[PDB]
């Protein structure tokens, strides 16, 4: 049972440094590698570079060289990594793993979002066909949670009973924040009489909505 | 730098059938001590990414037998005997034989179900919406088969459009099909103008494009 832990999500300013912890259990820390590698959407995975705990000994990939920091507290079991002067090219999700020969337990990721925008709630809006449309064995409703920053935002739906059919859609971004929507399909023989309600958390500015489908 | 160059870039079967994905290094991956650090990692779609095949051929723990790896010198292949939806996922190549160690591009797999129309479904801006100066109209088309699809706006039939969003998932596991949500966002005034405000998705499903409207007078 290995196992390793990383810090949760950041938004820092462009121009500061972060630092995300990679917390390993299960193994003998210091006689294995920690690797560190980033995923940016469209460059797939790139190698960072690697620590090992106990020398101190890193390897940097040359572009890094500067950039990334490695180190490591064998006392703690765990190993950090500060990126300095961070750019918009540094918004990425890094990954920690373990190292030998190969990569073969991975962390769970930690996203960091370099970013001036400020943090912002969303505005959740229900979702209901209009007169003159709906008919059929189902009915197709949704929520459309608009107007949010930085990324990550949980949409549940609490329906009466029947139902799932659920869709959550990829967030974009519009003029600088972010837009998504959730759509559920219930069958019509209980909607509107159940109540279908969606629930939006966005942990980033710790809100949590509720709204009705009427 | 070890370059990795993955082929295809996508790739489509149908459950039960052969997978191969090619993997080619740019120089000798043959490490001092005679072992060649060639390994594979697949990242179902959600998650961090897994190692699946390490040094060439020797499947990781938990690795079915169907997935199988053979290759020497600078060509690698990965052969999947029989696909299944949880097969579903990106599959990369890599080295860690050579300072930095590097990975393919991947290779996304989709499942080639058969093809299904879009359940097209449109919605007014709401109230509260309505209430903030904006006016968003979304369309969704859910569940259908091939991915491609082109979706127009139309404002009382003229206005074809160019503010609008779409927003695509991935397969979906349990029944291998795609769903899709288009919003044109407009003012409440620009909105408040217009009468007909129609979704138009064609399809290879169709000769003819699968119309949405609402009326803002019907009833
Ligand atoms: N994929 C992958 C991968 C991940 C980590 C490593 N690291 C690595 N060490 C780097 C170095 O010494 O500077 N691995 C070394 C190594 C392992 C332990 C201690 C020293 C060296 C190695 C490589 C291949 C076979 C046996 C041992 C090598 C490849």
Redesign the interface.
Known sequence: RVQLLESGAELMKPGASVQISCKATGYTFSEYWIEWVKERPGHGLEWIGEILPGSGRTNYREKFKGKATFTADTSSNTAYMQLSSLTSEDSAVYYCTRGYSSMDYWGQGTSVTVSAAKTTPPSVYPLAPGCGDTTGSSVTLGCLVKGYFPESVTVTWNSGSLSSSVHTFPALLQSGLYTMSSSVTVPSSTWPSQTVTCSVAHPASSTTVDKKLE | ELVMTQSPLSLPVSLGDQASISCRPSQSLVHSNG?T?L?W?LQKPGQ????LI??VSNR?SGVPDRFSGSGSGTAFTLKISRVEAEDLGVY?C?Q?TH????????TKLELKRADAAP?V??????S??LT?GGA?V?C?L?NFYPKDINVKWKIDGSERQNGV?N???DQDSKDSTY???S?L?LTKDEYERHNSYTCEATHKTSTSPIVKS??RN??
């Open positions: 072992n650090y390994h990692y961090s990414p897994k190692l390490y040094r990781f990369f890599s860690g300072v930095p160690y590097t990975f393919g591009g991947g359940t479904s449109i919605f007014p801006p709401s509260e919406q903030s968003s979304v969704f859910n969003l927003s695509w998932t769903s899709m949500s919003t966002t609402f009326n019907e009833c």
